[PDB]
Structure formats: C-alpha cells, structure tokens
Amino acid sequence: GVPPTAELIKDEAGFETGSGEPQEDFVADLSVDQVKQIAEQKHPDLLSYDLTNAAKEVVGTCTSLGVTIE
Amino acid sequence: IPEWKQEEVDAIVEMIESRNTLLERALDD
Amino acid sequence: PRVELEIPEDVDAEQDHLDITVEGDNGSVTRRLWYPDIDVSVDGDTVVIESDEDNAKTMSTIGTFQSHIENMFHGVTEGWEYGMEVFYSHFPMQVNVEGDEVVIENFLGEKAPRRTTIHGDTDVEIDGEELTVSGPDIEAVGQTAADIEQLTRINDKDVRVFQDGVYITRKP
RNA sequence: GUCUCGAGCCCUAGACAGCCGGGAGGUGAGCUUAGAAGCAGCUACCCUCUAAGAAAAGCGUAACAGCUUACCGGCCGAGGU
Ligand SMILES: [Mg+2]
Incomplete structure (x- = not known):
C-alpha cells in the first residue's frame, strides 16, 4: 500500500537524482521534525515496535544518499 | 570458558526474573 | 579396539569360521569377513568385531566390517x-x-x-x-x-x- | 601408504563432520540504465527484528525466479583441527 522509502525522501527534499559517490557528496537535506512524519506512515512495512527505532531505518538510507541532518 | 557465553547466560537470567544448554545453565541459577 | 553391534529383534545371526550368516523376514545373507587379527564373533545377541591391533589399516577394516553387518541387518528386515x-x-x-x-x-x-x-x-x-x-x-x-x-x-x-x-x- | 615425536588452537557451556530447521525486514540499497532487483559497472557497505541472516562468498537468469555460502538453532556425542 505505502510507497517505497527511496521515493518518500525525494518528495520533502526537492531533488530527484542522488549522487555519484554517497556520503562523500552531499546533495539533499532534512530535519528532525521531517523524519518524525515518515516514521508515522510505515507501520506494517517495518518490524520495529517503538517509534524510536522506526526512525533509524529511515536514517539508514539517508546518510548513504547524500542527505545531511540539521 | 568463552566471554560471549558468560554474557549470554547473564542476559537470559535477566529475562527469567522479569542454545538449549545456555537455557538450562540459566535455569539452574 | 572392540565394537559391539546390537542385533535387532526381527533378526537372528549365526556364525562359523570367518563366515557370518544373517537371517530375517526379507531373506538371508552370508558373508565372509576375513582380515589379519580381526575376530568377528556372536556373543549371545550382539556381534563383536575385535582386534588386538590399533593401526590405521586394521582400523579401516573394523569400520568396514561394522557397516557391512549393519547393512545386512537392514537387508533382512526392510531390504x-x-x-x-x-x-x-x-x-x-x-x-x-x-x-x-x-x-x-x-x-x-x-x-x-x-x-x-x-x-x-x-x-x-x-x-x-x-x-x-x-x-x-x-x-x-x-x-x-x-x-x-x-x-x-x-x-x-x-x-x-x-x-x-x-x-x-x-x-x- | 604407514609408523613415531613436537608445537599452536578448538571441545560435554557439546567441538570436527554429516543430516533437519532457519536463512527474515527497511529495500527490488544509490548511482548507471529501457532494466540491473546479493551477484555487468561506480560508491557506499548503513539499522530494525532476533537465537541467527552479507548494501551478499559461489553458481544460476535477458533481467526476475531458482540453488546453496556466510551466519543461528536442532539431532548426534568425543575428541577435533
Ligand atoms: Mg566421431
């Protein structure tokens, strides 16, 4: 039902393509309040019990794309 | 006596109060 | 070395000289188990394969005789x-x-x-x-x-x- | 091939091997690209669940699928390397 993680990051960023070299070349940006909205959406997709660990799975795709958190 | 086996027994004894060999060892305690 | 093999209830095995005969409901098998200093005997209801020697060549054959007898047990029952x-x-x-x-x-x-x-x-x-x-x-x-x-x-x-x-x- | 002597390491908290079971999700990573989803190539190689389970070691496909490897559990039981 709920679309993939790679698509949900590109909507609230404004950028389409990633990078030639991840983590070494920073492209997009996010904030803490913006990751708390993506954590509410995926409930049957993630295996995490709490909302605390549900955010870590989204961050575990972000830093390996070129997204810096402020 | 491996260090990870000692840490595992202390993790099982923690979830009794609150491998089948490591469970038996933890129950005997 | 000495390996004792317990005979199944469906099976009964006799022995003379170096020949071992194994009888059962699916038939009978007679084999010759001959090697230096290895004595194979029937002790009541167990088959005993023993030798006074513990060298690699003797050990190879004790293990071969074991599998030969266990296979005869399976043959005379389940086939x-x-x-x-x-x-x-x-x-x-x-x-x-x-x-x-x-x-x-x-x-x-x-x-x-x-x-x-x-x-x-x-x-x-x-x-x-x-x-x-x-x-x-x-x-x-x-x-x-x-x-x-x-x-x-x-x-x-x-x-x-x-x-x-x-x-x-x-x-x- | 077989005999003998030494050293290190692992083992009844169960070793070596075999057989059974599990080998999971985020996500078919991103870039490349019509597509590439462990496995053409470039870069990274991160965290949840958990007793394990790689950003995948080897095959396999046009690409999937499919088969096992790592890794965990069980059966077994004495030495093993
Ligand atoms: Mg010709």
Whole structure:
C-alpha cells in the first residue's frame, strides 16, 4: 500500500537524482521534525515496535544518499 | 570458558526474573 | 579396539569360521569377513568385531566390517531398494526380464539385444517406464542396479546427444 | 601408504563432520540504465527484528525466479583441527 522509502525522501527534499559517490557528496537535506512524519506512515512495512527505532531505518538510507541532518 | 557465553547466560537470567544448554545453565541459577 | 553391534529383534545371526550368516523376514545373507587379527564373533545377541591391533589399516577394516553387518541387518528386515527410469529419445527401448537376466532390446536402434545376469536373490520388477531393483544383499542389489546402467554404455559417440538408457533414480 | 615425536588452537557451556530447521525486514540499497532487483559497472557497505541472516562468498537468469555460502538453532556425542 505505502510507497517505497527511496521515493518518500525525494518528495520533502526537492531533488530527484542522488549522487555519484554517497556520503562523500552531499546533495539533499532534512530535519528532525521531517523524519518524525515518515516514521508515522510505515507501520506494517517495518518490524520495529517503538517509534524510536522506526526512525533509524529511515536514517539508514539517508546518510548513504547524500542527505545531511540539521 | 568463552566471554560471549558468560554474557549470554547473564542476559537470559535477566529475562527469567522479569542454545538449549545456555537455557538450562540459566535455569539452574 | 572392540565394537559391539546390537542385533535387532526381527533378526537372528549365526556364525562359523570367518563366515557370518544373517537371517530375517526379507531373506538371508552370508558373508565372509576375513582380515589379519580381526575376530568377528556372536556373543549371545550382539556381534563383536575385535582386534588386538590399533593401526590405521586394521582400523579401516573394523569400520568396514561394522557397516557391512549393519547393512545386512537392514537387508533382512526392510531390504534394499534402487529405483531406475528408462529414458529414450528416438528409438523405443524394450526392457524386459527374461529368466534370471534382464534384457534390453532395440537400444539406439540395435538389432542385437543387450543383456546382463541378475546377481543372486535380487528381484527386478518393471512397471512400464520404471524399474525397481530389490533384495537383502546390498552387494548383489547394488551391482545388479549398476549392471543395468552400465549395460547402455556408449564410448563411441557423444553421451550429451545420445542420452538413451536406464539410469539410477533412487539410491537407499 | 604407514609408523613415531613436537608445537599452536578448538571441545560435554557439546567441538570436527554429516543430516533437519532457519536463512527474515527497511529495500527490488544509490548511482548507471529501457532494466540491473546479493551477484555487468561506480560508491557506499548503513539499522530494525532476533537465537541467527552479507548494501551478499559461489553458481544460476535477458533481467526476475531458482540453488546453496556466510551466519543461528536442532539431532548426534568425543575428541577435533
Ligand atoms: Mg566421431
């Protein structure tokens, strides 16, 4: 039902393509309040019990794309 | 006596109060 | 060394000299187990394979005698089953059991029938496209099963194109 | 091939091997690209669940699928390397 993680990051960023070299070349940006909205959406997709660990799975795709958190 | 086996027994004894060999060892305690 | 083998209830085994006879409901198997300083005896209801020597050569045979006796126990009870499937590409092969020998006719277009003799008490049953070799003596059954596959040997032409022949499907 | 002597390491908290079971999700990573989803190539190689389970070691596919490897559990039981 709920679309993939790679698509949900590109909507609230404004950028389409990633990078030639991840983590070494920073492209997009996010904030803490913006990751708390993506954590509410995926409930049957993630295996995490709490909302605390549900955010870590989204961050575990972000830093390996070129997204810096402020 | 491996260090990870000692840490595992202390993790099982923690979830009794609150491998089948490591469970038996933890129950005997 | 000494290895004691407990005899099953369905089985009863007698022994004289170097020969061991193992009887059961599926039949009887007599084998000769002869090697230097290895004594195989029947102690009531256990088979004892012992030797005063512990060298690699003696140890190899003690372990071989063990598996030979354990296999005889299985043979006289549940028996030994080898399943085979007859495959052909162009020429319709005619496999038939004619007496104490299994005959394969019209193999690869041959006018002359290919045949092999069945080893002892081994029974070969055929049900259309399938063949099932069975009996108490694994030595006899294993060989008769092998003999059938070896019978369609082709050394002259490519095996990958000319694949016709009965092949072993099930190993026990 | 076989005999003999030494050293290190692992083992009844169960070793070596075999067999059974599990080999999971985020996500078919991103870039490349019509596509590439462990496995053409470039870069990274991160965290959840958990007793394990690689951003995949080897095959396999046009690409999937499919088969096992790592890794965990079970059966077994004495030495093993
Ligand atoms: Mg030629």
